[PDB]
Amino acid sequence: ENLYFQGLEDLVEDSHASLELRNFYFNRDFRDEWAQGFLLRLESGFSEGTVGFGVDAIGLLGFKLDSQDDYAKLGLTAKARVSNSLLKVGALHFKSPLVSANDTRLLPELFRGALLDVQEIDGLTLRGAHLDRNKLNSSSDYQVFSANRIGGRSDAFDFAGGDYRLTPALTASLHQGRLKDIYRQTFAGLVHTLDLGRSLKSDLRFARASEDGGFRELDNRAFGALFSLRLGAHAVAAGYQRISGDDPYPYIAGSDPYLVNFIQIGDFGNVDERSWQLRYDYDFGALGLPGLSFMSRYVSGDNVARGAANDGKEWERNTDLGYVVQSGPLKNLGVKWRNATVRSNFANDLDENRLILSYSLALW
């Protein structure tokens, strides 16, 4: 009676829910898809007690329009909290150096598994996960994993990692993971944030991977550095990335790699690839146009392995223009245009346009 009945009420009492509408148009021109999506998110409260329990749900629905994102899926996530720690089991969507779920299409990628987040020690976040399925952004069904470019088949991704604030400005990270029967990978990172009150973020990354289990021998290293300068409404970033070893940068296929020069289309993670990035952002708020945004970036890669040579080269430009309605009936309605051009001597030259209309409504 009592505590159990009350627990079920408390799950609802402290719950919240939202509905997102997305209209997505995509075109690729080599030197076409329109779809509508709905995303219903429910997050329960927790039952009272030292250990609190809850449940989240995500409802996804997509269909193609005339002018594979044609599915419906409901995913549940059981959760438990104690002190400042949280366990989620079921449908997962999160970002971390060794595994990050994608959401740059119509409907999000989901993983099936368990994710633990422990924040009991001052300045220290410890995370770990066991994942056993990948639901690609464009499909309804959970499937087993493979690695980007490298292939393979795996039914387990495991990682643990810590992000530690050594000082208020400096955070050190170490994450270690395994895509079972394909690869092992470890990531170290150091991120320094200098606020001049005007700011400079310095983001250094290094990851090494080797084979796991009976998989063929694998050797990859990836160094990245990204320096992000904010100057009022302006932002400028400069990035450098170096891939080395016999193999390209491994990550779960369908998901996002934690590479500083991973942009709209390319990851710049090819064998031996050296690349640099320049990025500019302007926030129109100060000018008096608060919903408006502009970003443009350019990444140039060389040294890419082409057989026994290293004369592979590619570049990619991206430009994002966006507006979010600030007031009136259509407040929160957003439109984003993402335009990309890729030119390469080892892959397909491509131009891509995305147009995304989005609207989110808080239900309660």
Author numbering: -8 to 22, 31 to 66, 86 to 215, 218 to 384
Quote the study on this structure.
In such microorganisms, the majority of small molecules are taken up by members of the OprD outer membrane protein family. Here we show that OprD channels require a carboxyl group in the substrate for efficient transport, and based on this we have renamed the family Occ, for outer membrane carboxylate channels. As expected from pairwise sequence identities that range from 35%–50%, the Occ proteins share a similar architecture, with a slightly off-center constriction formed by the inward-folded extracellular loops L3 and L7 and residues in the barrel wall.
The pores of the proteins within the OccK subfamily show a considerable variation in size and shape, suggesting differences in substrate preferences within subfamilies as well. As with benzoate/glucuronate, the channel that is most efficient in pyroglutamate uptake (OccK3) was indeed predicted to transport this and related five-membered ring compounds. OccK3-mediated transport is affected only with the cephalosporin cefotaxime. OccK3 thus appears to serve as a specific entry channel for this antibiotic, which is borne out by the liposome swelling experiments.
